[PDB]
């Protein structure tokens, strides 16, 4: 009786990096916006995953999304083949990871992760 949420403001479309579907804006993103938390089941240490680290830097734990029961829509952002096609970066604030929009994004483009860079 259950669909995998995904937030109106988004759509899954044929993605351009990868085969099969990817996450697309249906309306205007923002610089500054920021969506999450990212959502995964925390794993001790023994893509879809994100380490969580604290104050000194050091690893808590990481997060999996590799079940989709245990995570949630941020899991369909794929990363960006090229650091010019990123448009979110990954931002640890306190211990969740967010992606923030590191620049306006146009309506019907691919959501790509990669790092902040300069």
């Known amino acids: 009786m259950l669909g995998m949420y995904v937030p109106d403001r988004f759509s899954l479309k044929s993605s351009r990096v990868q085969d099969g579907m990817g996450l697309y804006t249906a309306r205007r993103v923002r610089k500054g ?3 999450g938390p990212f959502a ?3 794993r001790m240490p023994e893509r879809l995953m994100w380490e969580v680290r604290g104050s000194k830097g050091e690893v808590l734990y990481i997060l999996d999304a590799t079940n989709p029961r245990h995570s949630n829509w941020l899991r369909f ?6 650091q010019e096609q990123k448009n979110l970066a990954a931002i640890q604030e306190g ?6 929009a ?7 483009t691919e959501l790509l992760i990669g790092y902040l860079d300069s």
């Open 102 to 108: 590191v620049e306006d994004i146009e309506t019907d």
């Open 77 to 82: 952002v794929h990363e960006a083949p090229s």
């Open 95 to 100: 211990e969740n990871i967010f992606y923030l």
């Open 40 to 42: 995964g089941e925390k």
């Open 33 to 35: 916006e920021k969506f």
